[PDB]
């Protein structure tokens, strides 16, 4: 007879859990709720990292699996399959199962981390002047509200701050024109800032 020790339990969600997946590089448990959301929990202190919806269709049966041989996470719904990996110590799970659009005017979800968003805002407010471009006011307001919502959680937990991403719901051509204008404006001034990459 083998001995198994029990040293407590933790509460993740009241909606139930169906499937489990563990990422060994970040020590993160990717719990799959019964409502389709993926709850990312840290495995070092019991404090939950993030929550995600994968930008998939509502009511879909999300199934998440991990592979350590290739270090890749697979999300399978009733429609499509998405593959994700680590990026700067966090998993970009907001647009993991995003359906590829067919037109330039379709609204696309744009997930960004905190330091990148801060560098973008600093460049747009100090070094980059793109007020003449389409959708500039909407992008500035979205960046401002995302950063002012993130900064409250920034001073509490560093890992939860890093895992927290700002999701912009904007058209594809507007975002492409804005990013091209940022690239051109930073290239014509010969300034090497972190917002350019």
């Amino acid at each position: 007879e083998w001995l198994v020790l029990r040293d407590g339990c933790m509460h993740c969600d009241a909606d139930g859990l169906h499937s489990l997946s563990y990422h060994p590089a970040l020590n993160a448990i990717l719990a799959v709720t019964s409502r389709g959301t993926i709850k990312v929990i840290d495995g070092t202190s019991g404090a939950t990292l993030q929550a995600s919806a994968l930008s998939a269709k509502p009511g879909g049966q999300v199934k998440c699996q991990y592979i350590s041989a290739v270090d890749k996470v697979i999300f399978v719904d009733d429609y499509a399959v998405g593959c994700r990996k680590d990026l700067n110590g966090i998993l970009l799970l907001d647009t993991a199962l995003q359906t590829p659009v067919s037109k330039q005017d379709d609204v696309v979800q744009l997930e960004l981390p905190v330091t990148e968003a801060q560098q973008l805002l600093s460049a747009c407010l100090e070094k980059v002047d793109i007020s003449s471009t389409e959708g500039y006011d909407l992008f500035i307001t979205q960046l401002k509200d995302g950063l002012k919502n993130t900064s409250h959680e920034t001073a509490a937990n560093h890992k939860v701050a890093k895992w927290a991403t700002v999701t912009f719901h904007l058209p594809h051509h507007v975002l492409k024109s804005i990013a091209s204008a940022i690239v051109n404006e930073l290239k014509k001034i010969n300034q090497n800032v972190a917002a350019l990459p």
């Binding site: 007879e1 083998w2 198994v4 489990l20 020590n27 699996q65 697979i74």
Partner: protein, 290 residues
């Protein structure tokens, strides 16, 4: 982005998974179309084909089992490699047969398909081996729930379950097969190297995981297998004989006496514990060793 298995984007995916060669990710639809992506490299189209249920090997296997109507549905996906990799699909064939009115009989089989393209070797999208499951899978109308290669790389495990229909109820079967590397193509053996029965319907296997033997280092043994049942009883068994070595009862729900049944289990290396999800969404860590 998340690419659809087909260009139409309307078929629903029945099953998925990975095996001994997880560099390629397979996705099979309910209509019989399989798309394999090279997720190890940049996201692209690597293979795309459609399974025909009227293959000559499938036809002769169904003839040896007993117009002609056959409907094939894939329930598990795996890729086996030691020697180009091959795709192993756990299919279920439903066919009308005379009673000895027509009765729709179901039979679970394993299909092997070529993956690597040509640079008389078989072409991709064609059948390599049509393994026929033993008699108890056809008698109980079981379906292939899970396919998992073992940690040794020489053995394979197949966990079955009772297929629902659109007596003694069984919780499924554990079939351990031996890999065959006699030829240049990865194949399987007709004789199963181990057959384990689940006589308890309450012990239907829902999820499984494999524990590396080096954690215990803190006939050769093939590691340990942790399985979750329908009722939440976590069972840790030796892979050599499938004997119940460790039993973990499901916890009780808060505020009541209802069974907070475990549904899935994983292994957390940072906590060095079996992390299992409950019916109520709780997480329980089980420690091994003392």
């Amino acid at each position: 982005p998340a690419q659809f298995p087909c260009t139409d984007g309307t078929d629903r995916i029945s099953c998925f998974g990975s095996g001994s060669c997880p560099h390629f990710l397979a996705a099979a639809t309910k209509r019989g179309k399989i798309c394999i992506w090279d997720v190890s490299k940049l996201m692209k189209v690597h293979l795309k084909f459609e399974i025909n249920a009227y293959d000559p090997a499938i036809v002769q296997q169904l003839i040896l089992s007993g117009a002609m109507e056959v409907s094939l549905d894939i329930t598990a996906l795996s890729i086996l490699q030691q020697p180009f990799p091959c795709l192993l699909a756990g299919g279920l064939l439903t066919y009308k047969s005379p009673a000895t009115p027509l009765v729709r009989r179901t039979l679970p089989v394993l299909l092997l398909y070529s993956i690597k393209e040509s640079d008389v070797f078989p072409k991709p999208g064609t059948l390599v081996q049509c393994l026929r499951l033993p008699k108890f899978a056809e008698e109980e109308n079981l379906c292939i729930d899970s396919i998992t290669p073992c940690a040794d790389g020489i053995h394979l495990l197949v966990g079955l379950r009772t297929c629902p229909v659109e007596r003694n109820v069984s919780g499924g079967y554990l079939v351990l097969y031996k890999m065959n590397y006699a030829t240049r193509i990865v194949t399987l053996e007709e004789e199963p190297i181990k057959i384990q029965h689940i006589k308890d319907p309450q012990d239907t296997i829902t999820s499984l995981i494999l524990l590396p033997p080096d954690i215990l280092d803190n006939i050769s043994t093939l590691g340990h297998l942790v399985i979750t049942t329908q009722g939440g009883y976590v069972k840790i068994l030796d892979l050599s004989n499938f004997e119940i070595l460790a039993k973990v009862e499901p916890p009780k729900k808060e505020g009541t006496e209802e069974q907070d049944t475990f549904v899935s289990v994983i292994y957390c290396s940072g906590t060095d514990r079996l992390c299992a999800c409950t019916k109520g969404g709780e997480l329980h860590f089980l420690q091994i060793g003392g």
